Write a protein that binds this ligand. Structure first.
Ligand SMILES: O=c1[nH]c(Nc2ccccc2)nc2c1ncn2CCCCO
Ligand SMILES: O=c1[nH]c(Nc2ccccc2)nc2c1ncn2CCCCO
Lengths: 304, 300
């Protein structure tokens, strides 16, 4: 059976990620863009604009935390829908791990919708930690060959960039920018932590390269009063969601891409990272064409 | 590897499922009432019924209602998602069972049936509904679902006898939900006899007619392009639904009888349920601990 190379470029918004995925493709390679048309029209009306307004009305003391949460949470569901459908449709085509016959470059991974942004909004106070763990419990099983590229960019440059690379409905909120950057840095450490054999349950009381301190992983965000029982321990339901989190992240192949450079520099840097990435076989011979069409149809219908 | 038997008692609420299950190498995992009332959020059922009421009364709009209603389904289904997640690794291939697990509801009640009924009640968008559908976990081997049977008025009698905290006796919601489970049963038989929704879709414009399956609910205007075509994103979500439901094993329990009988009935259906092996030697004890701990912590 032919082989497939899947690469999900992810990380905080505003680093020039979407531009370099396109440059890469401009060079048997297909792109799955951000489903902007779904966010703007098909799933709901101006979801991004709705998200920024709600957070703003919250920070302004114009709505309550509960009003904000109800709105922020439903908005997250609309944002992640195209990501879940894509994963569920692609799943039965992915075979065991292995020039690929096909290279699929995705603009973000389901965890951006089911973990990272919801965690950042929790930090921003417009979502509850229980809702964040409900999304995490729904993260789909990690398929073989899940290569994820996370980006790095100094904060001052990112700030400067953001004042440029905004989004229709987006308001420049640097508290949110800081939150999302911290959430993705914790993600990176968590994968490291897990692959070095870390056990969050063993290290709970304590709340490439060497094994990170659990306090430097995502597990640290879930030490909130709402999830702790009278005896000070986490309720079993919340703890099992962390077991799920650990299970999902430990089989992923994470890489860091430096965005503090020109678009062409980023493309070439990503191109070399692409050599040491895990491929998989496809489950059937006609998987490649079928997969080619899914990406192109998704792109055509939702790219914007 | 020892064998396990999972049984998910599902269907519209208020038919006597727990009355029968509590009269029943076998653990029972109750519904997560404490999570709904306290752990996940404060009084989730009250919030759900109050919001619909307000919308019914015109005190709020369809959009305000949808945001609150959708957000609440997330709290309602959480314990079911984690449970399926943590259990999945232990389930082996199709196979007296070492253990029998009687679950109070399957994730599809939370990620498909209730959201669908709420859409049918005007307080949930069909796009939000297909997002929950897209997240339904893969159907593990040996997934046996028991659905209820009961004439509407006896069901209304039964419902009146057991309101949950914050619930308001809504006959429109009772019909919506009954409709959804009826369609659900027809949908499984449709898929099992070889039905292809994409092929039978035009009909909306030996197996049940697609008009009597869950597919008919998604011929909703919000999901269609100007030419009437379903957008591919939604079509892909319908492909997932078809995939998840076809491999389920459905069993019908007549509730229109006595608790002794209903309970007797449940035990008889057990003979045609499919068993599976567990994945490790230590799977049985761990699955046992999981069930007792879920019950102890979230069963009220
Ligand atoms: O609250 C938020 N949720 C999500 N979810 C999300 C889901 C899938 C892919 C990308 C983002 N994204 C947010 C939010 N605020 C700003 N953004 C970034 C918006 C621009 C993403 O291009
Ligand atoms: O909007 C609703 N959503 C759900 N979701 C739900 C989630 C998991 C298990 C059962 C139901 N349940 C609802 C709703 N209204 C009434 N009920 C019934 C509550 C009592 C179930 O016995």
């Amino acid at each position: 059976m032919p082989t497939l190379l899947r690469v999900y470029i992810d990380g905080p918004h505003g680093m020039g990620k979407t531009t370099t995925t396109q440059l890469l493709v401009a060079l048997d390679i297909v792109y799955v863009p951000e489903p902007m048309t779904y966010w703007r029209v098909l799933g709901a009306s101006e979801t991004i604009a709705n998200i920024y307004t709600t957070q703003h009305r919250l920070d302004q003391g114009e709505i309550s935390a509960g009003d904000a949460a109800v709105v922020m949470t439903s908005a997250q569901i609309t944002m992640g829908m195209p990501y879940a459908v894509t994963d569920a449709v692609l799943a039965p085509h992915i075979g065991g791990e292995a020039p690929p016959a096909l290279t699929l470059i995705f603009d973000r991974h389901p965890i951006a919708a089911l973990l990272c942004y919801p965690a950042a909004r929790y930090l921003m106070g417009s979502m509850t930690p229980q809702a964040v763990l409900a999304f995490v419990a729904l993260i789909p099983p990690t398929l073989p060959g899940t290569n994820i590229v996370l980006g790095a960019l100094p904060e001052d440059r990112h700030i400067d960039r953001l004042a440029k690379r905004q989004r229709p409905g987006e308001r420049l909120d640097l508290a949110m920018l800081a939150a999302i950057r911290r959430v993705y840095g914790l993600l990176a450490n968590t994968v490291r932590y897990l692959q070095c054999g870390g056990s969050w349950r063993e290290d709970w009381g304590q709340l490439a390269g060497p094994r990170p301190h659990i306090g430097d992983t995502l597990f640290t965000l879930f030490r909130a009063p709402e999830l702790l029982a009278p005896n000070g321990d986490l309720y079993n339901v919340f703890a099992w969601a962390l077991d799920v989190l650990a299970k999902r992240l430990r089989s992923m192949h994470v890489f860091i891409l430096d965005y503090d450079q020109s678009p062409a520099g980023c493309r070439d840097a990503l191109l070399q990272l692409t050599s040491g990435m895990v491929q998989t076989h496809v489950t059937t011979p006609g998987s490649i064409p079928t997969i080619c069409d899914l990406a192109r149809t998704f792109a055509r219908e939702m790219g914007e």
